Structure formats: C-alpha cells, structure tokens
C-alpha cells in the first residue's frame with residue numbers, strides 16, 4: 006500500500022503491479038503498483054510546489070538536512086546493506102561498502118559545491134562583480150540497478166544541495182532499496198515535496214521523462230536507453246540532461262614482474278559485483294607469448310576458485326548473482342554466440358544452480374573472432390585479446406564507440422605516460438583495478454558513455470547554473486559618457 | 491587580391507557559391523569570395539584531424555606562448571582590426587576598438603580559467619596517487635555570429651586551442667572580412683598548419699560543417715532558431731559536445747530612483763548600445779504605472795531622439811551605427827509596424843532616415859495594451875515598454891519569456907534587488923548597472939531558450955576539455971587483506 010512518496014506522504018500505485026525477485030531463489034522481495042501518468046504528474050507538481058521555499062532557504066540549512074541524512078544512513082547501515090543484498094544479490098561485505106559510499110557522498114558534495122558552484126565577489130571598475138549559482142527547479146533522477154543506492158544518491162545529494170527538488174524513479178529491478186533510501190531521507194527531516202519517489206516499470210519512466218514540468222533529467226543506465234532520452238530531448242536545450250551510460254572498458258596488461266598481483270588486479274577489475282559495475286574491465290589485452298600465457302592460465306585457475314553465492318552466505322562469497330534470470334540467460338547466449346564465431350573458452354561461464362541467476366566467471370579469448378561486437382555485456386564475461394605489440398594494444402583498446410574507463414598494468418612509467426596520451430576515457434588507471442573510482446574526482450565517460458556532464462565531483466556543475474551580477478547601490482553617470490550622447 | 495579559406499596552413503580559393511559582405515550604410519562590397527563547398531569543408535575537418543595529435547601532445551606552455559603571441563599581434567594591429575570591424579558591421583570606431591581589446595584580454599583570462607576549471611591536481615589516496623587531468627576533445631567547429639565578429643568566436647577559439655583542440659571556424663557570412671583579418675593575426679603569431687582552419691560561406695558551408703562526422707564538438711553563438719535546429723540535429727548523438735549560446739528577450743525593471751538622469755543613461759546603454767545588437771541588450775523595459783514612470787519615459791524619449799546615429803568613421807563620433815544589413819533593418823521596421831498594428835503605442839517611432847542604408851534610429855514602443863505579445867528577440871534598437879502595477883507584477887512580466895540570458899533592476903532598494911535575484915531566471919542579473927558589457931572574468935551563459943547549460947566566457951574551459959581521473963601506482967600489488975571469497 007505505501008508504494009509512492011509524493012508531497013510528503015505515501016500512497017498506493019494505480020498502474021501495473023511490479024514485483025522484484027531475489028535473483029537466486031526467485032522469492033518476491035517487494036511488490037506494489039507502478040505510478041500511472043496521473044501520479045507521475047502529481048510527483049512533478051509536488052516538486053514544483055516545494056521548489057521556491059527549498060531554493061530560497063539558506064545553504065547551511067540544506068547542508069544540515071543532508072548531513073542528517075548521512076547520519077541516518079549510517080545508523081541504519083546494516084539494514085540497508087541487507088536490503089541491497091536481498092534485491093541485487095550483492096554479498097553483504099560489498100553492499101556495506103555501497104552504503105558507506107552513500108554516507109560519504111554528502112561531505113564530498115558539499116566540498117564540490119563550494120568549489121565548482123560557490124559564490125565569489127570582487128571589484129570591477131566602480132562596481133562589484135558577484136558570482137552566484139542557482140538551482141534549475143525540478144529534476145528527475147533515473148536510477149540503475151547495479152548500485153541501487155549509491156548511483157541515484159550521487160545525483161540526488163548534489164541536486165538537493167543546490168536547491169533543486171527531485172522526482173526519483175528507481176530501476177524497476179531495485180525498488181525496495183529506493184523505498185528504504187527514502188525512509189532515511191524522511192527520518193532525517195526532508196521537507197514535503199523536496200524528494201518524491203515514483204516506483205514502476207516502463208510506463209512510469211516514459212511518463213516522467215516526457216513531463217513538461219521537468220527542468221532537468223539525470224540518468225544512469227544503458228547507452229541504449231540514454232540515447233533514446235537524448236533523441237527525445239533534441240531541440241529542447243532548455244532542459245538539462247545528464248547521461249551516465251555504459252562502457253566497453255579495456256584493461257591492457259604488459260608483462261609485469263609481480264604476476265600474481267596482476268591477476269588479482271584483473272579479477273577486481275572484471276568480476277567484482279559479478280561484472281555489473283560501469284567501470285568493470287570488459288576486454289583484457291594480453292601480449293602474445295609465454296608470459297601472457299602464464300598470466301592467462303593463472304587468471305583462469307584463480308577465477309575458477311572464486312566463491313559465487315548468496316548475498317548472506319557464509320563463508321562470504323566474492324560475488325553474487327546477476328540481477329535476474331533474464332540477464333543471466335542473455336549473458337549465456339552472448340557466450341554461446343561468440344564461441345559460435347570462433348571464440349575460445351579459456352574459462353567457460355556456467356550457471357551452477359538451475360533457476361538461479363548465479364553465474365561463474367567467464368574468460369573468452371576472442372582474438373580469432375573476425376567481427377567483434379562493440380557491445381557492453383553487463384555481467385562476469387571477460388573477453389581476451391592477444392596483441393603483438395604495444396601500439397596494437399592501444400589500437401584495440403581504442404576500438405570502441407564507448408569511453409568510460411581504461412587501465413594499464415605495466416612496470417613502465419613511460420608506457421603509462423604514452424597510454425594517458427593515447428587513451429580515450431574518463432577514467433584511466435595505472436596498476437590499479439578499474440573499479441572503485443572515488444567520489445572526490447569527477448566521474449564521466451566520453452564517446453557513447455556520456456554526454457559531457459561528468460558526475461561524482463563534477464555533479465555540482467549540472468545541478469546549478471552560474472549567475473553573474475554587476476552591482477552598485479545606485480545608478481550613476483560615468484565620468485566620461487560614450488560618444489554621440 | 492583576396493584571401494578566402496585557410497586550410498592545413500594554406501590560403502585556398504572557394505569552390506562554392508559567391509558570397510559578398512556589404513557596408514551596411516553605403517552598400518559597397520567590403521569582402522568577396524566563393525564559399526567552401528562540401529569537399530573543402532571535408533578538407534578543413536581533415537586538416538584539423540591531422541594536426542590534432544601533435545598539437546594536443548605539445549606542452550601546455552607552448553600552446554600558451556602561441557596564444558600570447560596572438561594577443562600581442564592583435565594589439566599591434568588594433569587600429570586596422572577596429573576599422574575592418576567598423577566597415578563590415580557599422581559599429582563606431584570607438585566601440586570597435588573595445589571589441590579588439592576584449593579579444594586581446596581573452597587570452598590571459600582563458601589561461602586563468604583553464605588552470606582553475608580544467609587543470610591538474612595530484613594527491614595521495616589510500617596506497618596510490620589520485621591524479622586529475624583534463625584532455626581536449628579533438629576537432630571542434632566554431633560558428634561565429636555577426637554582432638561581435640571578432641570577440642565572440644575568439645571566446646570559443648582561444649579556450650579551445652589552449653586546451654589542445656584543433657578548430658574549424660565558420661564565421662557569419664555577414665562578417666567574413668573580420669574573420670579573415672583575425673586568421674591573418676593567428677598566422678602572423680605562428681599558428682601551426684591545421685590547428686585553426688577558416689571556411690567562409692553561407693548556409694551551404696555551415697550545413698556541411700555541422701553535418702560532418704569528423705567533428706567532436708560544435709561551439710555556436712547565434713540565434714535560438716538556428717541553435718535549436720543544431721540541437722535537434724545532434725539528438726541521439728551525445729558523443730559530440732555542443733555548446734550553444736543563443737539570444738534572449740531581456741527585461742530591465744526600473745523602479746522610481748533618485749537619479750533620473752543616471753537611470754535614463756543606464757537604460758540607453760542597456761537598450762541601444764551597438765544599435766541593440768548585443769545579445770545582452772534590454773528588449774523590454776518594465777516601468778511602474780504612474781507619474782514618475784511617465785516622466786522617466788518622457789525623458790528617455792527626448793534623450794533617445796538626440797542620440798547620434800551614423801557611419802562607423804564619422805566625426806563627431808556617433809553613439810551607434812547601422813544594423814547589419816538592409817534585410818535586418820527591413821525586418822525590424824516590419825516588427826514595429828506589426829506591434830503598433832496590434833495596439834502598441836509609439837513613444838518614439840524607429841525610423842530609417844537614409845533610403846538605401848541600414849541606419850535605424852531608436853524605437854520605444856509601449857506594448858502594455860498588446861494582447862498576445864510575441865516572445866521574440868528583435869535584434870536591433872527597438873525597445874518594448876510594459877507598465878506594471880506593483881513589483882510582483884514586474885517580476886512576473888520579467889519572467890514571462892522562454893529565454894533567460896540577462897535581466898536587470900534599477901532600484902535604490904537593496905532589499906528589492908535581493909528579491910529580484912531570488913526570483914530571476916537569467917544567467918546575467920545586474921543591479922543599477924547597464925545590462926550590456928559583461929566581464930570575461932565571469933561565466934556568460936543564458937538559461938531557458940538562451941543556452942544549453944554550457945556557459946562560455948570564464949566557464950568556456952569546461953566544454954573545451956574533459957576530466958580524466960587516474961589512480962596510479964608504480965607497480966601492481968596485493969592488498970594487506972584480500973576481498974572475501976578469494
């Protein structure tokens with residue numbers, strides 16, 4: 006019954022029933038009716054009504070509320086980790102780190118706001134030049150399922166900080182996490198209408214994206230969906246759109262002295278979250294020859310031993326299920342399809358429990374595949390390409406329309422310096438796993454992975470617009486008038 | 491002799507349609523050439539592409555030295571450049587000289603903005619070093635306007651080259667001579683072949699360039715109509731960065747103030763400087779109902795009728811010159827006629843005193859009684875007046891527009907300005923200062939239909955480079971504690 010949160014109260018949905026299912030055992034974890042078009046309009050109108058007072062209040066009051074939210078999350082951390090685990094399959098240790106990221110987002114967002122969208126004042130001739138930044142108004146946040154708390158939070162926190170009001174539409178796959186996140190905001194004192202939650206599937210998302218009352222839409226999800234949204238907004242520059250989309254991220258591994266360290270780094274890059282982070286390594290470039298062979302064989306051996314299991318299983322698993330049976334089925338077909346085109350399974354991905362979305366890591370050598378898809382496979386399926394020399398590695402790493410992350414494992418600083426020069430990505434690491442980018446830095450992909458509105462530290466930039474003012478306490482005549490007067 | 495396109499370090503004659511620019515008063519040919527056809531546009535994009543890796547590789551300090559030599563070259567040729575701006579746009583020499591000074595000054599401010607907004611930071615994070623760098627996109631097109639034919643394109647070109655992009659510049663077909671001389675200065679400054687390319691032309695050329703798949707970015711200043719078409723064209727192509735600086739319908743609210751003379755002067759500078767062709771010019775003057783407001787307007791009309799309007803090099807110097815073409819003048823006069831037809835009252839009718847010349851005298855029209863007032867930008871010296879009942883009505887009317895570039899308040903009350911800031915919806919919001927002449931040291935971007943949330947001037951840096959976040963360690967290593975399950 007308490008499905009949507011609009012204008013400061015909960016209400017039942019009137020649209021299609023939505024259920025989220027435990028990815029392993031398939032039990033219903035949450036259900037409710039989606040928001041119909043009417044309820045979506047109510048959510049936008051609620052944000053609209055709340056906006057003037059929220060925008061008008063002192064910044065420090067908005068900061069206090071965001072700080073109370075982080076403190077409330079912290080106090081409910083175990084409960085939220087458990088819900089994230091229940092719904093996404095993520096092991097408890099990993100879900101806990103997601104909650105920690107949500108808590109930490111507040112202080113970092115405050116720092117970024119003062120730096121990127123703060124207030125400055127200075128003399129300019131006879132007058133005073135002031136710079137301020139102001140919120141857009143009502144913004145929709147579309148959440149993904151992979152970090153169902155942290156990634157929407159990475160839009161919601163800086164948006165509310167700047168003085169916008171938000172309508173949050175979570176992934177239909179992770180509604181329970183969103184519900185609990187709203188409960189933390191509510192417990193923290195958030196004013197009615199400042200943040201509104203509309204749950205639902207396609208129809209709800211479509212109605213919100215189409216709503217003319219939005220001043221902005223902040224999105225994390227697939228490049229397919231984000232491109233649709235971008236096309237939809239073509240010719241409407243008045244509405245700010247921030248698109249954080251997927252990638253096809255290469256990890257280049259030169260022969261390095263500490264081979265086990267490299268193998269561990271590859272696993273953390275490719276298979277953490279069962280390969281469901283935006284930044285996971287999708288293609289592993291490994292040089293031809295004996296060392297490369299040893300690297301791969303060790304990777305395959307260690308990856309085969311990785312614990313895959315239930316979120317709350319003990320001993321704790323390294324990774325959990327993919328988000329649904331549908332997603333697992335789709336990945337197994339991608340593996341089958343590639344193998345059909347000549348890919349060699351160095352370690353074949355399997356589904357060890359019938360009717361559960363658990364998948365074991367996959368490592369496929371696609372060196373011999375003629376035409377390789379420039380496609381993002383959102384799961385633990387790592388493609389390997391063997392390369393002849395470093396220039397060919399760089400060429401291959403760049404052979405994608407995407408541009409989120411890239412990385413080099415190499416003992417050579419000179420080699421990394423070249424890699425930086427030739428890379429085409431928002432995140433470029435040296436000897437560190439591709440995953441776990443810190444909120445203290447901007448996070449945005451280029452090419453098909455974004456629309457030049459990087460999030461994380463730079464989220465501030467799309468949450469407020471600059472207002473430049475020249476101010477003087479009275480009109481006055483200049484000492485010398487312009488000619489002709 | 492003519493100099494038409496500059497591509498890969500060489501001057502080339504055009505293969506497209508003939509293009510002439512005409513002195514807006516005398517109608518004499520100021521510049522003439524053939525536009526760049528599609529194959530020449532492709533050559534220019536390819537030239538930028540070929541030059542990009544080396545230019546982007548270069549140490550920042552070497553790009554800075556070129557930009558500084560360029561500024562110094564503009565300074566040495568300042569008189570020459572002011573007279574060409576005057577010739578082509580009609581703008582008085584005194585005002586043209588200020589445009590050249592803004593061009594020179596853009597370099598040092600862009601370097602400051604680059605280090606602030608798109609610089610490099612490095613520090614420890616866990617057992618690694620977190621480094622932030624910014625990289626250029628690649629090849630960017632710059633579409634120039636006619637109103638500031640040197641300063642506004644320079645405001646995209648300088649920060650774009652500084653960040654390491656290479657550029658294809660398509661100037662307004664109304665101001666090609668200004669762009670030619672600007673390129674001659676870049677060339678004299680030592681610009682490397684292909685780093686900045688110039689394709690002159692009309693719509694044929696602009697359409698070919700905007701469509702070219704080789705662009706990584708397109709930076710535009712011009713009308714909302716044209717910018718919206720570009721935005722539509724790029725829908726579904728988020729990989730190409732678009733920065734759109736469009737026009738506005740800017741309101742200036744005037745409360746009763748003690749210094750009536752200063753108020754009138756400030757309004758004139760806001761509405762009629764550059765013959766009303768700055769994108770920040772006041773388009774709507776909001777004046778309180780009642781005797782004081784009637785007096786303000788009576789004075790404004792009397793003073794506006796005496797403003798000197800004339801040729802760019804006339805002496806005594808005119809306050810303002812012609813609008814950009816006879817066609818533009820025609821369009822503005824028709825707009826005035828249409829509005830009066832619908833009930834607007836001519837407090838001061840705009841006139842075209844010399845047949846065959848695009849000189850227009852200032853217009854002030856009371857549109858209060860006009861039913862459905864167009865939310866339209868009239869790019870010329872035609873000021874619309876709306877009389878309001880109370881301050882809340884003034885704010886409502888100020889905000890009754892799809893645009894959002896500039897807004898201002900003349901008022902002796904700081905409290906009224908504070909409220910005005912709270913309720914304003916514009917990127918430039920001034921108190922007791924003319925709406926025109928914004929600082930390069932601050933961001934310059936309109937909201938609503940006036941931009942796409944990519945402000946230029948100080949924040950141009952933001953769209954000229956993308957951040958690259960790096961975590962770095964001299965070698966791979968194992969954590970003291972492995973993740974579970976391994």
Ligand SMILES: NC(=O)c1ccc[n+]([C@@H]2O[C@H](COP(=O)([O-])OP(=O)(O)OC[C@H]3O[C@@H](n4cnc5c(N)ncnc54)[C@H](O)[C@@H]3O)[C@@H](O)[C@H]2O)c1
Nearest residue numbers: 147148149150174175176210226227230249250251252283
């Ligand atoms: N660059 C980044 O920051 C980043 C970060 C994390 C994840 N991702 C990504 O997220 C992905 C998968 O997660 P996902 O499945 O939730 O992405 P998604 O595209 O499926 O969905 C994200 C969201 O947009 C919506 N949506 C779905 N269909 C819609 C439609 N037809 N019309 C309008 N809205 C619609 C949702 O319901 C929702 O809240 C990737 O492809 C991936 O790499 C990107």
Ligand SMILES: NC(=O)c1ccc[n+]([C@@H]2O[C@H](COP(=O)([O-])OP(=O)(O)OC[C@H]3O[C@@H](n4cnc5c(N)ncnc54)[C@H](O)[C@@H]3O)[C@@H](O)[C@H]2O)c1
Nearest residue numbers: 633634635636660661662696712713716735736737738769
């Ligand atoms: N926000 C800003 O900073 C700002 C500042 C000053 C002026 N302006 C503005 O500039 C305007 C007028 O100048 P303008 O006449 O050059 O505007 P414009 O749209 O006609 O021209 C600007 C440019 O884009 C091009 N172009 C024109 N038609 C095109 C087409 N059909 N397809 C592709 N490209 C095309 C040009 O040829 C050119 O270089 C305004 O409406 C105005 O307020 C904006």
Ligand SMILES: [Cl-]
Nearest residue numbers: 417418419420
């Ligand atoms: Cl080295």
Ligand SMILES: [Cl-]
Nearest residue numbers: 284440441442
């Ligand atoms: Cl991450």
Ligand SMILES: [Mg+2]
Nearest residue numbers: 188191192193
């Ligand atoms: Mg309670």
